[PDB]
């Protein structure tokens, strides 16, 4: 299968239960499932990513994204846009910050990623 991304999700899920949710994002925001046929693996990933964002306090967002790497930003925006489809409007509020503080280029790069 090569879906060891299924071992990356439990960490983030627990990182919600504990309290420090952002820690889980910094976790799953490494080594994401590249485009495939098997979306069922990616869906369970996306499901976690948006669940993580849902319980990160608004005040903590500008501090994370400012510390984040450009790979991480391009990646986080990339999932925000895939997240907007059916998941809350909290995503839309993330989109607002990770654009205003990390530039428009992030979206431009999301526009490429195959």
């Amino acid at each position: 299968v090569q879906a060891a991304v299924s071992q990356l999700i439990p960490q983030a899920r627990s990182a919600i239960q504990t309290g420090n949710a952002l820690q889980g994002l910094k976790t799953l925001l490494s080594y994401v499932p590249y485009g495939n046929d098997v979306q069922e693996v990616r869906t369970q990933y996306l499901n976690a990513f948006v669940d993580v964002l849902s319980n990160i306090r608004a005040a903590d967002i500008p501090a994370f994204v400012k510390e984040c790497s450009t790979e991480e930003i391009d990646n986080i925006v990339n999932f925000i846009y895939r997240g907007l489809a059916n998941n809350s409007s909290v995503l839309l509020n993330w989109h607002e910050k990770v654009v205003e503080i990390s530039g428009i280029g992030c979206i431009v790069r999301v526009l490429n990623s195959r």
Binding site: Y81, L84, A85, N86, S89, L92, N93, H95, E96, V99, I104, I107, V108, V110, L111, N112, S113, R114
Partner: protein, 166 residues
């Protein structure tokens, strides 16, 4: 309440997803058509994005080197509103020659669609056109609201008049 961050994400997308060069095909004898409408050159197409707000409102953005296809899914909640748009949209499309940025028919499962070519992002300014599409999304919702609070307005005035004569 959430109408502001929505249109934000739509603008932020469009500003990027609407930056087009002039592009001639590799198929048809020295031609130039919106490469997003043919889609027969993956080299040139980008990644499509959608921007939601709720189960109701959303819009997809399909982008290519020389063209973009922006499609809106407008706020409809009932019966009266569902038709009120379907006649505003069915009207605008019947004027697509003067309203040059409209599609003759929209994308399947969307209310209205714009076909923006590089020819447009030169005839008018890069942003002045972006700023417009946002203003469109604002105004249609606005009219559908006004047209509603004016059929309800008349209904009262009519039904009240006819009854009073008795």
């Amino acid at each position: 309440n959430t109408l502001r961050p929505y249109l934000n994400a739509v603008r932020s997308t469009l500003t990027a997803s609407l930056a087009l060069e002039e592009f001639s095909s590799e198929i048809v004898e020295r031609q130039s058509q919106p490469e997003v409408e043919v889609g027969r050159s993956p080299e040139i197409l980008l990644k499509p994005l959608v921007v939601s707000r709720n189960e109701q409102e959303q819009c997809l953005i399909e982008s290519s080197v020389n063209s973009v296809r922006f499609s809106i899914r407008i706020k409809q909640v009932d019966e009266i509103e569902r038709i009120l748009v379907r006649k505003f949209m069915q009207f605008l499309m019947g004027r697509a020659e003067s309203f040059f940025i409209l599609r003759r028919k929209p994308v399947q499962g969307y209310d209205i669609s714009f076909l923006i070519t590089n020819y447009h992002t030169e005839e008018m300014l890069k942003h002045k056109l972006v700023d417009f599409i946002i203003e469109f999304m604002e105004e249609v919702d606005a009219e559908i609201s006004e047209m509603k609070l004016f059929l309800n307005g008349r209904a009262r005035l009519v039904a009240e008049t006819y009854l009073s004569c008795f």
